[PDB]
């Protein structure tokens, strides 16, 4: 049985409605921008259009598309080095999804997977990526 809850929005001018406790928990969880991350999936049509604005991103996006990776943009800038981990991460997430989905109702045990390759997780909280917004060419050449 799921109880109803009051959900309020606004700081000084507050609007109260009734809502689902689980839906509110998901809403706040997705607000943890550092933990839950949006990831991009590409198609060949859109990868080609990217080249019209950033040639380097087109090449890196093509690699992600060829491997069918849902990848964060920040990671995409380092796909050359992160590719082996990303492929391993893809496998582990798929294993976990399958295990949880196939489990019988009422079975809420944690999935068995290698969390060390999945980011962001306690086992691997990620890397300190250096900014790549640095010119490396001499205008006089």
């Amino acid at each position: 049985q799921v109880p109803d809850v009051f959900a309020t929005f606004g700081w000084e001018r507050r609007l109260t409605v009734i809502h689902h406790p689980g839906v509110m928990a998901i809403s706040k969880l997705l607000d943890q921008r550092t933990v839950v991350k949006p990831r991009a999936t590409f198609n060949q049509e859109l990868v080609e259009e990217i080249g019209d604005y950033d040639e380097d991103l087109q090449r890196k996006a093509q690699v992600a598309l060829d491997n069918g990776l849902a990848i964060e943009w920040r990671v995409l800038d380092f796909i050359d080095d992160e590719l082996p981990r990303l492929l391993a991460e893809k496998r582990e997430i798929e294993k976990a999804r399958e295990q949880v989905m196939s489990k019988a109702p009422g079975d809420y045990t944690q999935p068995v997977f290698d969390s060390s390759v999945v980011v962001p997780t306690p086992a691997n909280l990620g890397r300190n990526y250096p900014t790549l917004n640095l010119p490396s060419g001499d205008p006089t050449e």
Binding site: P3, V5, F6, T16, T34, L125
Partner: protein, 226 residues
């Protein structure tokens, strides 16, 4: 509502510099004794501590989960009050149109004081008459002299106070088990390690429990120039 202006940035979240620096006392203060800012950060710290602990969520009941996030389980008393509050607010910048009032179901006229000016326009169509203004005072079942439409005043009053979302939450919500600071530390180490902070609120909160300036980079975070 249509009468409200645009959401502020604060309407979504508060800056971490508004977090009370005495977190140890904040997590021990009763709800009735917490101010607006203190109550915001009590709920956010405790709510995010439970949400950022995935292994414990499936075994946590909705009653306990709602308490941790600071959400009030609804009941007929609180629903009635909240509903009449939102109806009062809506009528601030909206028209007052509804079914014809009778003795069984009088027109409900919400008010904070003991009186509110009301006009009767009669029924629908040819039964509509010119506006007849009257002062609706509490404790009397008013009858329009023209169409016999029954009116009644409803007062948003509770124990020397009017009805507010804060009042409803204080009167009906019950503080649960006292928040344990060990949970804050445990979750802090879970998402914050080796210069990576994936729970910024828990890094600041743990720093304050430690005394302010203890965790790496926090002295530099607290040093301002103006």
């Amino acid at each position: 509502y249509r009468h409200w202006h645009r959401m502020s940035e604060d309407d979504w979240a508060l800056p971490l510099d508004s977090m009370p620096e005495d977190v140890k006392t904040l997590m021990a203060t009763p709800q009735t004794e917490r101010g607006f800012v203190e109550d915001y950060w009590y709920n956010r710290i405790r709510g995010e501590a439970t949400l950022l602990d995935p292994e414990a969520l499936p075994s946590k009941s909705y009653i306990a989960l709602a308490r941790d996030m600071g959400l009030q389980i609804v009941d007929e008393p609180s629903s009635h009050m909240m509903g009449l509050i939102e109806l009062y607010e809506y009528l601030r910048g909206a028209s007052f149109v509804g079914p014809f009032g009778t003795i069984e179901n009088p027109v409900l006229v919400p008010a904070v004081g003991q009186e509110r000016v009301v006009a009767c326009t009669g029924g629908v169509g040819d039964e509509e008459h010119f506006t007849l203004w009257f002062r609706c005072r509490e404790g009397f079942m008013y009858r329009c002299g023209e169409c016999d439409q029954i009116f009644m005043l409803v007062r948003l009053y509770y124990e020397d106070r009017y009805w507010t979302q804060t009042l409803v939450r204080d009167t009906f919500m019950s503080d649960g088990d006292m928040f344990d600071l060990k949970t804050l530390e445990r979750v802090h180490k879970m998402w914050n390690k080796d210069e990576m902070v994936r729970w910024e609120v828990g890094y600041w909160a743990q720093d304050y429990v430690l005394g302010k300036g203890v965790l790496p980079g926090m002295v530099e975070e607290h040093t301002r120039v103006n």
